[PDB]
Amino acid sequence: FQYFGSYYCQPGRDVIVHLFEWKWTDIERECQWLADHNYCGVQVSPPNEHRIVTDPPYPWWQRYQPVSYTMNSRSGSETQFRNMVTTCNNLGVYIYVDGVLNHMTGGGSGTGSDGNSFDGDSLQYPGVPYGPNDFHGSDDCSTSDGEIHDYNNPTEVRNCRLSGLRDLDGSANYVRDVEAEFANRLIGWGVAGFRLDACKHMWPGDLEAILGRLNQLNTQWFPAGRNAYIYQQVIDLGGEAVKATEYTYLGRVTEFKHGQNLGNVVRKNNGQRLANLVNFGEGWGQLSGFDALVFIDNHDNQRGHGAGGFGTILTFFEANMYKIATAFELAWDYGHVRLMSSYNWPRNIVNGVDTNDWVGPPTNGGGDTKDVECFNGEWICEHRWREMYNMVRFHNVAIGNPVSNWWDNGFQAIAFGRGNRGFIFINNEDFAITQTLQTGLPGGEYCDVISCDNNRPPCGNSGGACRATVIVNGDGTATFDVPNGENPMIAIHVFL
């Protein structure tokens, strides 16, 4: 039985970006920028035919209610999808499909994004086709409303309806065949892998049966005999009967503890200290790095969906702390890193819940999506922020080097290197620090890539606040002058 947790990237590329609700034409155009900045790939929103919800008007979450496995979605047509995949693959930037296999729609009836009808009440999905026999039901789920309530009951979690979403019978050969045909069609077009939605709600044995039906990647671009890359969404913050460790034998698993812990640390919640990150990773009770897909925030928890709440996870709304957490995550050596890329919406937290957590992407009406224009107040484009992409370059130069030359002052300042390739100093204190440290880097003149454009003089001041150059002495020490406040961190590194 094959393992699907290994990704495939061009040399010098590694980090993934979730281009949440981006249209295919925009992702196709973005792949040139992503390749130039040595990102490895893109997670795309569910591309199959999905529900069109008009009350409320065209929420993002309509794409998590499949109507069929045809390929006309809010992000564009099948033609536009295949154009995107071909162009991106040709640039060495790969595509990971948000694959929604646990369920179809909730209740009610309507027309999906490709003109096929559905009826959640009668369990009729003629575009597939699925009927009542293809779903779990009262024989499989004994809760009074048929929905999931008790996360200490694995059978309930896996056989009942997640928030009323009609729950497919993943044990049936027909459903396994239909879902593998969908995945294999995507793979045949050049898709490199999948973010598998709601895997906590599916039996690992059913996922194993589906994955065992997959074809290997398309050799127009990928090496012969290469399994697709599979990472599985399982929210495991402890204290439940379904565990992430149940899924790691199939592929990687989303490590939600990672963003919870880094959010709490950088926020200094309940007396947390940055110095505690000295052993961050598996030693914090998390998955092994090889098993983990890691990220500061995702499309659910930036808007309170999933575990819930707004006092821990860091997002673009907390931009300064968010950059600190992401910089640490990119400079560290733990997990496959995914960066969220968001759109703005009128987040309105009332009694701990965002009342507008349903709002979809920038739109002119009718359920369309507007062309991306980064930094216009509608598209956030975190992956295009200099502090992000320069730390992606830092991360790339550092690939294969362990953490070295760790230093901490005991509280909210840390520093560490990656072999002889890069060094970062993070000052999360409310004061300024002047500290000479062994960097492990060759002597020379370096630029702070958090504030400057380049890694060596001329440093480049496109952001307007490029700091004075950092001198690494012949002995490898450098004196770091890091004021507290905005971007309170200095990162330096060598060239490839």
Ligand X SMILES: OC[C@H]1O[C@H](O[C@H]2[C@H](O)[C@@H](O)[C@@H](O[C@H]3[C@H](O)[C@@H](O)[C@@H](O[C@H]4[C@H](O)[C@@H](O)[C@@H](O[C@H]5[C@H](O)[C@@H](O)[C@@H](O[C@H]6[C@H](O)[C@@H](O)[C@@H](O)O[C@@H]6CO)O[C@@H]5CO)O[C@@H]4CO)O[C@@H]3CO)O[C@@H]2CO)[C@H](O)[C@@H](O)[C@@H]1O
Ligand Y SMILES: OC[C@H]1O[C@H](O[C@H]2[C@H](O)[C@@H](O)[C@@H](O[C@H]3[C@H](O)[C@@H](O)[C@@H](O[C@H]4[C@H](O)[C@@H](O)[C@@H](O)O[C@@H]4CO)O[C@@H]3CO)O[C@@H]2CO)[C@H](O)[C@@H](O)[C@@H]1O
Residue ranges at the known binding site for Ca(2+)? 102, 158, 167, 201
Please choose, from the candidates 267, 388, 370, the residue with its C-alpha nearest in 3D space to the C-alpha of residue 326. Answer: 388
Residue 98 bridge partners (DSSP): 195
Contact yes or no for 459/447 (Cβ under 8 A): yes
Residue 41 bridge partners (DSSP): 16, 94
| Residue closer to ligand Y, measured from CB, 101 or 459 | 459
Q: 45: which residues sit within 8 A by CB, 6+ positions away?
A: 19, 20, 21, 22, 63, 73, 74, 75, 98
Contacts 24+ apart (CB under 8 A), 410-414: 410/273, 410/275, 411/273, 411/274, 411/275, 412/268, 412/273, 412/274, 412/275, 413/274, 413/275, 413/482, 414/274, 414/275, 414/277, 414/278
- Tell whether residue 122 is a contact of ligand X (CB under 6 A): no
Name which of ligand X, Cl ion, ligand Y, none residue 163 binds, using a CB cut-off of 5 to 8 Å depending on partner kind: ligand X
For residue 356, which amino acid is it?
N
- The single residue among 47, 76, 106, 335 that binds ligand X, judged by CB under 6 A, is 106
Name which of ligand X, ligand Y, Ca ion, none residue 167 binds, using a CB cut-off of 5 to 8 Å depending on partner kind: Ca ion
Q: How many CB atoms lie within 10 A of CB 239?
A: 7
The footprint of ligand Y (CB under 6 A) covers 319, 375, 384-387, 462-464
| Residue closer to Cl ion, measured from CB, 159 or 233 | 233
| Residue closer to ligand X, measured from CB, 152 or 219 | 152
Name which of ligand Y, ligand X, Ca ion, none residue 165 binds, using a CB cut-off of 5 to 8 Å depending on partner kind: ligand X
| Residue closer to ligand Y, measured from CB, 249 or 375 | 375
Name which of ligand Y, ligand X, Cl ion, none residue 386 binds, using a CB cut-off of 5 to 8 Å depending on partner kind: ligand Y
Beta carbon of residue 242, minimum distance to ligand X (angstroms, whole number): 8
Name which of ligand X, Ca ion, Cl ion, none residue 65 binds, using a CB cut-off of 5 to 8 Å depending on partner kind: ligand X
Beta carbon of residue 306, minimum distance to Cl ion (angstroms, whole number): 9
The piece of 160-168, 208-216, 245-253, 291-299 that touches Cl ion (CB under 5 A) is 291-299
Name which of Ca ion, Cl ion, ligand X, none residue 347 binds, using a CB cut-off of 5 to 8 Å depending on partner kind: none
- Tell whether residue 233 is a contact of ligand X (CB under 6 A): yes
The piece of 75-83, 232-240, 271-279, 432-440 that touches ligand X (CB under 6 A) is 232-240
- The single residue among 14, 28, 197, 387 that binds ligand X, judged by CB under 6 A, is 197
The C-alpha angle 219, 223, 224, rounded to 5 degrees, equals 70
- Tell whether residue 65 is a contact of ligand X (CB under 6 A): yes
- The single residue among 241, 278, 307, 465 that binds ligand X, judged by CB under 6 A, is 307
- Tell whether residue 298 is a contact of Cl ion (CB under 5 A): yes
Locate 452 and state its tokens.
């400057």
Pattern of binders to ligand X over 130-149, x per CB under 6 A? -----------------x--
Locate 203 and state its tokens.
């039996």
- Tell whether residue 45 is a contact of Cl ion (CB under 5 A): no
What distance in Å separates the CA atoms of residue 9 and residue 204, rounded to the nearest whole number? 27
Beta carbon of residue 375, minimum distance to ligand Y (angstroms, whole number): 4
| Residue closer to ligand X, measured from CB, 169 or 387 | 169
Name which of Ca ion, ligand Y, ligand X, none residue 418 binds, using a CB cut-off of 5 to 8 Å depending on partner kind: none
Beta carbon of residue 188, minimum distance to Cl ion (angstroms, whole number): 25
Residue 204, CA distances (Å) to 210, 365, 451, 487 in order:
10, 40, 45, 43
- The single residue among 22, 61, 222, 416 that binds ligand X, judged by CB under 6 A, is 61
- The single residue among 82, 185, 243, 305 that binds ligand X, judged by CB under 6 A, is 305
- Tell whether residue 165 is a contact of ligand X (CB under 6 A): yes
Q: Which residues are annotated as a binding site?
A: 102, 158, 167, 201
Beta carbon of residue 167, minimum distance to Ca ion (angstroms, whole number): 4
Locate 135 and state its tokens.
């779903």
- Tell whether residue 70 is a contact of Cl ion (CB under 5 A): no
For residue 428, which amino acid is it?
N
